[model samples]
Target: MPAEYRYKIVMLGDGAVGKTAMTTRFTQNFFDTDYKDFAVKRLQLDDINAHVTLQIWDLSVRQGFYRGARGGLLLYDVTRRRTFINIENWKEEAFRSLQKEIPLVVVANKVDLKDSRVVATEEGEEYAKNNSFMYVESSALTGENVEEAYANLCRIMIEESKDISEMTST
Candidate 1:
């Protein structure tokens, strides 16, 4: 048996840029262009014998879904600039839904296509720095940094809310 570190993590972003793919890539090493294609919406993280699970919300706008999530992943397409520009609105939407300054992460997806990328790496880094947010670039299609980004955000949230984690722990 191994120690399990349980934590809740939420993914937030304007549709696309592979939020669902990112989730799939991390938990199942699966990425699908079509939403219906990727499975594993829920996952149990294992640390030895103990485990922690997460309900991945792949919320799409057409469904008017996504409610009551506590944290967020602000994803942008490295090849598209608008997604990068919308970070402000993403943060606002998350703040409204979460009703607090929840842990936010800036993720640049499609990193494997960086050569064709329109959003420069420096710009993304600057955005994170200016906004006091942690950032990482990932290729959901390639499973790069997908897991670490979510894990890093969870760690940040735990560090920020040590009391919450401690209270919930045995």
Candidate 2:
């Protein structure tokens, strides 16, 4: 029998960066207004990827919330340059506990609002390249690339889980 896997994926960013929206969009075809919540679902992935349950946290999950986290998403608003700049701070704060590298991705949100967009996609790519993180562009409002973003993150988590499972005894 294959081993079962469970993991948490925490999404963080400055207030109103569409972090909540992304979760809602993925879990319920939804995002709007500020809310604290999480959703869980079984995704087919891993040695047990086909039997894994992913707990997605859509709220403020600081240092104390690292226990079950296997993936991290640092979100930023494309419409607000400050949010983009603040990604560094958020990323640092979110991973302070392990203070070690985890499967993280930098998301440039609100790409649909091109007129309001201040942070260019190239900038996001450059930052990701420099930090050695994966980059993806998304719009929680239009639900664009939202699933793909989660898909990639989960993919990485599954890959990392291979080594993680080896380090443990079932």
Candidate 3:
């Protein structure tokens, strides 16, 4: 058994950015395009392969701010540059509160639609590189990489050991 890591993982993004859809797929393994509400889910990822509690918070339009995240998965619509722009602000705030040390994974969602794509894959990779975070492109509608994205983030957080005090200086 592993010592439980008490941490909160919040999905900080703009409204209608498919946060709910992503969380539903990740937590419930279901897909619903009409889901438009605040959904928070918690599950024990312990004893399965890792020992940690994953807490997901689908931020509301009004309460999108003040996310006390252990780490974050930022979502943006590839078809909308505005959504991508919003990510800059969200990531900035989240990192500021987290002191730029929390593990963050940038996710470009809605990549299944080829015709509607506006954000280039290179641009996304460059953004992630500049931010020092990992990047993943996914489709919440079709359940593509939704689990993989979160799993990747979880692995990174575990590798880094999220807590600032427990981190070893190198």
Distance from true location, Cα of 105 in model 3, Å: 0.4
Per-residue lDDT for 91 in model 1? Answer: 81
Task: Pick out the ten consecutive residues of candidate 3 with the lowest summed lDDT.
Answer: 37-46
Query: Could you give candidate 2's per-residue lDDT for residues 64-141 as a string of tens digits?
Result: 566567787889999889998999887776667666667789999989998889998899999999988899999888
Q: How far off is residue 36 in model 3, in Å?
A: 4.4
Local distance difference test values of all predictions, in order: 0.70, 0.80, 0.76
Candidate number with the higher lDDT (2 or 3): 2
The Cα error of candidate 2 at residue 153, in Å, is 0.7
What TM-score does each of the candidates earn? 0.77, 0.84, 0.81
Question: Model 3, 37-106: lDDT tens per residue?
Answer: 2344443454345655677765554334445566778888898889988988887777666565677789
- Residue 93, model 2: Cα distance from true site in angstroms: 1.1
Question: Quick one: how many clashes does candidate 3 have?
Answer: 0
Give lDDT tens digits, candidate 1, residues 48-162: 2433345556656522333544456789888878888887887887676556777778998998995789998899999989889888989988888888887666556546556
Stretches > 4 Å off in candidate 1: 1-8, 34-51, 60-68, 164-170
- Residue 13 lDDT in model 3? 71
Better of 1 and 3 by TM-score: 3
Best by TM-score: 2
- Ten contiguous residues minimizing lDDT sum, candidate 2: 43-52
